[PDB]
Amino acid sequence: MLSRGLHEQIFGQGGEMPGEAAVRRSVEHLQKHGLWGQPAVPLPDVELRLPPLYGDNLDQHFRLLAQKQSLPYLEAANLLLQAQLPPKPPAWAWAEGWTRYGPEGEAVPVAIPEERALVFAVAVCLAEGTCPTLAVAISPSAWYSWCSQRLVEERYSWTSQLSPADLIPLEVQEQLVVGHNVSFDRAHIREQYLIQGSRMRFLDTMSMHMAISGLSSFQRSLWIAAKPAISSWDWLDISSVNSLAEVHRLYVGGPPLEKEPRELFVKGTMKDIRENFQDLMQYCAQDVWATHEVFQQQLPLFLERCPHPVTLAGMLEMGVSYLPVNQNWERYLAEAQGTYEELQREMKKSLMDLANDACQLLSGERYKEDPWLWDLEWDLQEFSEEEEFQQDVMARACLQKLKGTTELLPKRPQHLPGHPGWYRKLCPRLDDPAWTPGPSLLSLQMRVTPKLMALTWDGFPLHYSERHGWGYLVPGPYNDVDIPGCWFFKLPHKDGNSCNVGSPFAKDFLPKMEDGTLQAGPGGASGPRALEINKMISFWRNAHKRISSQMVVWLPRSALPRAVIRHPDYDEEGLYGAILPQVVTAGTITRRAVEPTWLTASNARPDRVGSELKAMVQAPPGYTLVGADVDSQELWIAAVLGDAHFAGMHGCTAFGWMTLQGRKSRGTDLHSKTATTVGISREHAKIFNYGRIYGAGQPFAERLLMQFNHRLTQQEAAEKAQQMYAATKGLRWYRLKGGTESEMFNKLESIATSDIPRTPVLGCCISRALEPSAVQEEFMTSRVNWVVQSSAVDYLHLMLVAMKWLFEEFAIDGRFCISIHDEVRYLVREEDRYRAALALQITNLLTRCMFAYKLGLNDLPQSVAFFSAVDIDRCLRKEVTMDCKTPSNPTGMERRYGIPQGEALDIYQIIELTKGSLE
């Protein structure tokens, strides 16, 4: 206990060799930077009898669990690896279901592939929904084909459960499935949408390729292009761009794969599929064969790159992610799209009214003095008697006979003649585009919506004369940035915004709607509201394609377990579905899960129509999401790695000291407590700090500061080197880079340039595209990022294997790890939810302890030994008490409030018998 605050354990021998010199060094280091003398608040001690460990250490314990979890899938992988494949059959079958091709291509119908291992590929017809159309599979024995039954002509009208394929036996051993982008095929494999778990796991050659000589995003562009800037190119021969054909070319030397030129699946109809069935089936089988080749060349190399069984077990577990939706995903889509349409129509009406009111300057020539529309041409091109109710039919038929020169004179732009040129361009024709009375067909995308609204700053034409919005837009030819405006345009000066296309830019205009010198102004009623509309609309405008058209498969009543049924919340004409995120387990140079929509940073935010995407991922009744976000995961990992490099004590480096002791309130915390005082503001100093532990420099920091607000380069990180001086004081010489400040980044630098596995915890090797030994290169920033982010991936892997071990050793009915930006959720039955919290806490205890066991730290601080809060909920939201903008509130839907536990969950054990509640 104590020694500046440490926890009491159950595992462990005596040990206790801190070292007097180490303690003296740590104390004299904590003397500077933070104050060595802080009484701090001793947290309550927790007595917890851990479950029986295996082996003699924690590393061996973790090595035994992962071997127990990866043994049969590795057996199946080796069964595939040591297999011989006969030639492809001459003629594929036409029968529905599965067809097996024995010797000499003898076609026999089979129920399912009764094989312990497979290489699987699926083709979908984009025109006819998202149901699969044909699949080809192989095993060590023979070939298999599947036809999807849509080749007949009947109506099905979507919303079915037998639409996808079938790959799992009735279980009346482990069923490995190999593929490229195997998540996409897993979305169609079926028996993966069941809430009850299944023992099939998936190996994605995309994931292995990212592990084995993957490519960065800045390197993918340079690889495609070559199909300060001086670089070595010896990594080109080991790295691909993640395509089946290219991966097969890279790992296997042979003829390039041919592609379908007509592309009858992406751009075609089902009739084209029926006509070209043999060719498309051949193409699918070719893809499967190349996949098998790649897998055979990958698996032994894979196990060489990541010798730890834990990495493989974690990849297997992370390949099965599961998002229940529960009947409100469609409702969320419908209300979101309706609100989108309403706001769009309102903004369009406001724009048309602004255009109409802009015509009054024509009545008095006053457009010339107007700073807004001065540059527009504004040229006025033309472009008693008895009622006599008779000859109506002749008059009606004269219009039909008026083809030729009679209708040539009016043509399209005849209505509202004499109006200025711009207004006539907005006005459509009378006949073809209906009339749409007014200047319809007007939107923000046009160059004319500016100067009809907005025009803040001083001069804001927004003309795409190789410069877009022109303007110095700051104090001090004539009338360039003057308030009256009406520039002579004697000579263009791209002042003020001198970055031009060099800066990466972003949607910084959306948060600049709030003040930021971006509002309409004189309009009063309809001007600013259009900008408000854009602010509320942009997110859904950009992302409705992805959020919509998500593959949702609605489980029938027979596909649900006895727990979802016989619950207080049931039926109500309810649809309980699921979305497999189609997430690649390793999708980056770091083996992070990558998913463009589900795995991004977003939360329910007011004044955003397309928000609360994470919500509506609602657990089935009788089940709940038990999950947690690790408290500054990457920050603590950098701190612990830096602390282990400096001495044996956790808080020695003064950056892990602040991470351990610093608090949000009444505490020196880097996020929202300090780094705003030296910096600008909270929630930007967080982004400022997270960019430094991932590797950055004065250029990126200066650009980030400029993006934060309108400040010159001197106030930016050009004259401001103080953030660089007081934090990340690396590359310091005359020291025979290491620390010299709060942050110890030299451990990551030494990790990157070592040629070893470089992972301090699980020993997962870096991609061969980034190894200095493979190629001397200066991609150091990506590697520094990789160390911390792949340590985070290893933390996730350790959490996954530990949670699986605890759920299988103790009968905890939970599964389906969903990982989102260092946060982990588990869909667990309600009756065991508290245990799932405790287990999760125990996991965070063991995982951190594992992170402690390596790098030479036999003890862990009490503060980080447990999660701050274990979020037990029926929904996926950042906090247990939050709201949304589009609905009235979460209680408009059936969303209660959860609980974050804390130390209450510690009043139990992990065995089934907790407090006598069971039985």
Binding site: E342, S384, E385, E387, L399, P417
Partner: protein, 397 residues
């Protein structure tokens, strides 16, 4: 801010010269001009189409202007100045209708009528719990001045829905009402809604309009869980229970009532626009689907004549085509066209058509639009078609 001048100049406001804003809001104003009556009729028709014609399972509801039921002393501060106002200390020379049960009462809202007709609507329907009753009419309310009976046009729609979805139905109705108020409004941002709670704890939404004086309530929605309905008919509940699903349950009634006169006043206020414009042009930019006069036929120089019968024929054809046209070619001696155009725009005249000496041969008549102060040339043929297309565009969107 002197918008009363336009209301007085055009036949859109009440006859009384002195019409205070408070009196108009309370419904004690002398009345409204023919343009105001037409605008109110158009708004009522649009609301009925949106709620009655458009919404399924909704049927019209008729409520008596006065309730002859004995009931009890109503929401009248003075009980006919009889029980509390006795001539002299006694002056017992005698209830004189002092008892409320003795005589009828002036209905103030359609809620009682909706409750009475709920049973009839349920019987008519096929036992379906979802039902609707709409009623638009004049309601009389007491206004005290430091008394009078003010009559205001109001539309009330009561939807009986299952209690489980009662909150959802109320929210949907509030959203529909807010959208309808936004539609046909130049600035939909002005009209908003606010959540409110009743004395007994009943929740609801109240619609408000941000008039230049301030925010004023123009509509109110209240949800009752079979409380008022049970009170009206408490003898039996089997006949008052609707079948929302496989079982019959007591329906929950969400009643939304909006003051039609208040809505018309708010729309008129919204039509008028307000600094830095540098272009002052008094115009009532009312929605075309609700404007009183859509087409205003006129006459040329008057030197050639032939315009009066042309306007009469255009009006007759529009009437045969469902378009209302004001025959403005009868009046003469104007001596100026700018004043006529300004008056028509202030009267919410969407388009003004003028026939000149070149109308007989090459009949390209002049067209002026309130929205854009620019002249156009249009052939005599298809003018009715153009007006119909503009009206359809306004109504649809």
């Amino acid at each position: 801010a002197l918008l009363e001048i336009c209301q007085r100049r055009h036949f859109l406001s009440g006859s009384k010269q002195q019409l205070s804003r408070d009196s108009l809001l309370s419904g004690c104003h002398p009345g409204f001009g023919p343009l105001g009556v037409e605008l109110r009729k158009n708004l009522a028709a649009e609301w009925w189409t949106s709620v009655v014609v458009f919404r399924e399972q909704v049927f019209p509801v008729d409520a008596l202007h006065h309730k002859p039921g004995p009931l009890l002393p109503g929401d009248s501060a003075f009980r006919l100045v009889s029980a509390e106002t006795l001539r002299e200390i006694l002056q017992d020379k005698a209830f004189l209708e002092n008892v409320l049960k003795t005589s009828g009462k002036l209905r103030e809202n359609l809620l009682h009528g909706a409750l009475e007709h709920y049973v009839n609507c349920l019987d008519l329907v096929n036992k379906r719990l979802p039902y609707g009753l709409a009623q638009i009419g004049v309601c009389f309310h007491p206004v005290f001045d430091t008394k009078s009976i003010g009559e205001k046009t109001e539309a009330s729609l009561v939807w009986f829905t299952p209690p489980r979805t009662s909150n959802q139905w109320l929210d949907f109705w509030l959203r529909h009402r807010l959208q309808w108020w936004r539609k046909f409004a130049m600035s939909p941002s002005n009209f908003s809604s606010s959540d409110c709670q009743d004395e007994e704890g009943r929740k609801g939404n109240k619609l408000y309009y941000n008039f230049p004086w301030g925010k004023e309530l123009i509509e109110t929605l209240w949800n009752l869980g079979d409380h008022e309905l049970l009170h009206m008919y408490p003898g039996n509940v089997s006949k008052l229970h609707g079948r929302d699903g496989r079982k019959n349950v007591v329906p929950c009634v969400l009643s939304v009532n909006g003051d039609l006169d208040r809505g018309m006043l708010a729309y008129l206020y919204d039509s008028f626009q307000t600094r830095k414009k540098n272009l002052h042009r008094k115009v009532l930019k009312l929605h075309p689907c609700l404007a009183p006069i859509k087409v205003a036929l006129d006459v040329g120089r008057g030197p050639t004549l032939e315009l009066r019968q042309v306007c009469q024929g255009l009006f007759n054809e529009l009437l045969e085509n469902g378009i209302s046209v004001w025959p403005g070619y009868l009046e003469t001696m104007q001596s100026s066209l700018e004043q006529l155009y300004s008056k028509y725009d202030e009267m919410s005249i969407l388009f003004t058509v003028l026939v000149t000496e070149t109308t007989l041969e090459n009949g390209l008549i002049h067209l002026r639009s309130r929205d854009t102060t620019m002249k156009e040339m249009m052939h005599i043929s298809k003018l009715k078609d153009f007006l119909i297309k503009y009206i359809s565009s306004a109504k649809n969107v």
